[PDB]
Design a protein around this ligand. Structure first.
Ligand code: HEC
Ligand code: HEC
Ligand SMILES: CCOC(=O)N1CCC(Nc2cc(C)ccn2)CC1
Ligand SMILES: CCOC(=O)N1CCC(Nc2cc(C)ccn2)CC1
Ligand SMILES: CCOC(=O)N1CCC(Nc2cc(C)ccn2)CC1
Ligand SMILES: CCOC(=O)N1CCC(Nc2cc(C)ccn2)CC1
Ligand SMILES: [Zn+2]
Lengths: 409, 403
């Protein structure tokens, strides 16, 4: 009936219609002829006709959230954003506006299953930062605050925006905490295979390696129109959790571990047409990210076999589900270890349940929620999760967090 | 080296770093549900002269396949005239059926598409005749445990009269008896079909695994009940390799997965009743059929028996229990000598299939959410493979229930 997408939950039988997608101002990669919903990346790599359009949209969005849409303040602010843009080609956001955009960005992130927390975000303004040494100080303050000795707090630090005729502020690392990936002579990799390239760039910019499997990397912080600079994170700020299993004594002997703080640092924060090329954000890990992807992906630590081997499992055949049995124990070890270390973490069952709650909330608040099924469903025990059975509608909303081309090349 | 842009979509594999481009989607003639505004790829069902063309495309396609295109025949072949419709030759039907399966985006078992036994039953005119055909289909495909892929095609649709239909969603499914308190004895998924069977005069059972009778319908007539010969339905008692008490659960499952409620579309013609079968992927039984909250829902029970801590999610009792149930299935089928493939082998073979199809047609339509299995998603190779989804003809599609 309704001229809007009908989404069904196959478990509860319930139905809803998405009206939120109508506000989308950015096109996706799908077409009536073919769905490219599975692709990780759409496919690629500041005027007034178009910037002004995005700014007002954002401004309306903001006045509407404080329930003062169409008021005097609203009208004046609009006039104001046109004034600044016409005489300079760009414009600045108010503090309160920045806090709103940041939270909306997380809120709008289709791939994030932890959005029930979108409201509890600590925004740190660092739009006043003017050097790499300053970027590094903000960053450590961020980590200290977010880590909070185990009781993690979601936070984002927003550095200065882009301005034509000038280089952006950038963090070369994909995360604030990454383990080194050392290419070996035999062609293998010591450390995290994912970070081979960033590890190599650090060594070039004067960093001295170390053949460990979990050596925290330095940060390559870049201030406008200047070569990056190396900064070593003070060990005491980087909280880590050595891994051990609740009943398998040998697990601890594997010498495995992981850091508590998941802080993405390479994405672009876009608000009202403004681009914050450096805006690291952090929350707390969902156990499957560590115990399934980071540790079990063939191209990552790839430990399944090592673990199935201690378990005395028939690794000679797929039908023995050795891979499945091993992955579960590994995921359990991660959960047992964080809880043992009093470091915040959420399992995939709890996360997905709370994500379903988030959907209902969003339905009443915005009439919908952009969600990327393939990312909302956990990497293990997919259908044992409630979100598996939930049909989702994916679209692009702003404010948004987006991908941006790497600094180097 | 690779198209960039939207024309031919680049597809990447994140485990290997390999990249390819899909040129096959250009042959799509049917729009899906996605828009540049919002992707609806996760929905399960569509919100919801032309013929003469759909049927030349098929004929060309068929003639190009036998390496005999643009000749005399193909040309000569390209009834709609004085009838408004037309009929396919048998060899053409076999080719079309094989292609429908080949183009199914949600089937991870497509490595097997060339190996399909096609049964032509377009000459049925009674529910009775459908039954005999179906019985022979089950027998052939089961082949005493060494399962064979098979499809039986019934009379196409004729604009004007009713459709030949098989009311059941599957040729073999277990009855679901509701029984005041509000619980189901059997398969909750089959309450409706069970009730309809009783309504149509079937004497119910009183078991957790009573095989359901078939409700077969010839055009414009009320369906007719038929009871499958017990000797025809090969089942498999479930038990675990080490958990001795598992067999005590008294669980079991049938060996043959035969879909019967879909519509087969070939060259514009629609075959409303075309049951098709293959063999199971262990996780369909062990995860969906047995663990799903609205199916046999044995998850908790098994966890408690295993003495897991079901008080908190964090103990991962659901995860552990699910794996053991999946293993039980694989163990039971192997022990019983009945064909079946685990999600690891099937997806490994599907990856091969993708390579093949790339050399063969420059791509392969695939639905990621369905290719990746319901458990252990990222421990499977397909998880890290990007996929393109679009519709090709021939194709299998949903149709409304006959009631
Ligand atoms: C409160 C704890 C929290 C949890 C648990 C959480 N997030 Fe996210 N999250 C994202 C974005 C953006 C993505 C999508 C990443 C992409 O598209 O590359 C994401 C993705 C994810 C993923 C998917 C990873 C994958 O590859 O499958 C998980 C799991 C996740 N978030 C969990 C922004 C955030 C922000 C930003 C202010 C915060 C805080 C945040 N997320 C907090 C959290
Ligand atoms: C050779 C053994 C074989 C295996 C293993 C196999 N198939 Fe499929 N398969 C389909 C179609 C059509 C679908 C998609 C069903 C839908 O969209 O409702 C499918 C879907 C599936 C699914 C996804 C189920 C889900 O809900 O996640 C699995 C797993 C599968 N097939 C496995 C037609 C076939 C045909 C028909 C000629 C044959 C034979 C066939 N399939 C043989 C096989
Ligand atoms: C596009 C590449 O994305 C990634 O590598 N990742 C996706 C995003 C990220 N995970 C996160 C981030 C947060 C803030 C909390 C929990 N988990 C790190 C892994
Ligand atoms: C752009 C860099 O991208 C990456 O490093 N990755 C991109 C994809 C990433 N995660 C995924 C992928 C899917 C399909 C579902 C959940 N999570 C694995 C690593
Ligand atoms: C749209 C809903 O589809 C289904 O419920 N089903 C369709 C898919 C079916 N599985 C199958 C089918 C075959 C032919 C072989 C192995 N597995 C399970 C039943
Ligand atoms: C229209 C009939 O639908 C159904 O019977 N079902 C609906 C969905 C079906 N399978 C699914 C669903 C997903 C999301 C992925 C793989 N397989 C299982 C039950
Ligand atoms: Zn799509």
């Amino acid at each position: 009936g309704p001229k809007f997408p009908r989404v069904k939950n196959w478990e509860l039988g319930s139905i809803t219609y998405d009206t939120l997608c109508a506000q989308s101002q950015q096109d996706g990669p799908c077409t009536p002829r073919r769905c490219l919903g599975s692709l990780v990346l759409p496919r690629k790599l500041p005027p007034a006709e178009q910037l002004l359009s995005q700014a007002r949209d954002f401004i309306n969005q903001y006045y509407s959230s404080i329930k003062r849409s169409g008021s005097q303040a609203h009208e004046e602010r609009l006039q104001e954003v046109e004034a600044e843009v016409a005489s300079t080609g760009t414009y600045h956001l108010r503090e309160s506006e920045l806090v709103f955009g940041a939270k909306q960005a997380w809120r709008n992130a289709p791939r994030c299953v932890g959005r029930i927390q979108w409201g509890k975000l600590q925004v740190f303004d660092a739009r006043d930062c003017s050097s790499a040494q300053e970027m590094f100080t903000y960053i450590c303050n961020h980590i200290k605050y977010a880590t909070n000795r185990g009781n993690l707090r979601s936070a984002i630090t927003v550095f200065p925006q882009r301005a034509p005729g000038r280089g952006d502020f950038r963090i070369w690392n994909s995360q604030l905490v990454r383990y080194a990936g050392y290419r070996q002579q035999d062609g293998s990799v010591r450390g995290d295979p994912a970070n081979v390239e960033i590890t190599e760039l650090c060594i070039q910019h004067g960093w001295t390696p170390g053949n460990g499997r979990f050596d925290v990397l330095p940060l390559l912080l870049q201030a406008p129109d200047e070569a990056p600079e190396l900064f070593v994170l003070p060990p005491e700020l980087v909280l880590e959790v050595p891994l051990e299993h609740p009943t398998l004594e040998w697990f601890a002997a594997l010498g495995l571990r992981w850091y508590a703080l998941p802080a993405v640092s390479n994405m672009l924060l876009e608000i009202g047409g403004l681009e914050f090329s450096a805006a690291p954000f952090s929350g707390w890990y969902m156990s499957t990210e560590i115990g399934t992807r980071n540790l079990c992906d063939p191209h990552r630590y790839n430990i399944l076999e090592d673990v199935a081997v201690c378990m005395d499992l028939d690794t000679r055949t797929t039908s023995s589900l050795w891979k499945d049995k091993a992955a579960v124990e590994i995921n359990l070890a991660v959960l047992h270890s964080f809880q043992l270390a009093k470091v915040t973490i959420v399992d995939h069952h709890a996360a997905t349940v709370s994500f379903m709650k988030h959907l209902d909330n969003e339905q009443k608040a915005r009439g919908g929620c952009p969600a990327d099924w393939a990312w909302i469903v956990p990497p293990i025990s997919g259908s044992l999760t409630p979100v598996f059975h939930q049909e989702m509608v994916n679209y692009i909303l702003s404010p948004a967090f987006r991908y941006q081309p790497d600094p180097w090349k």
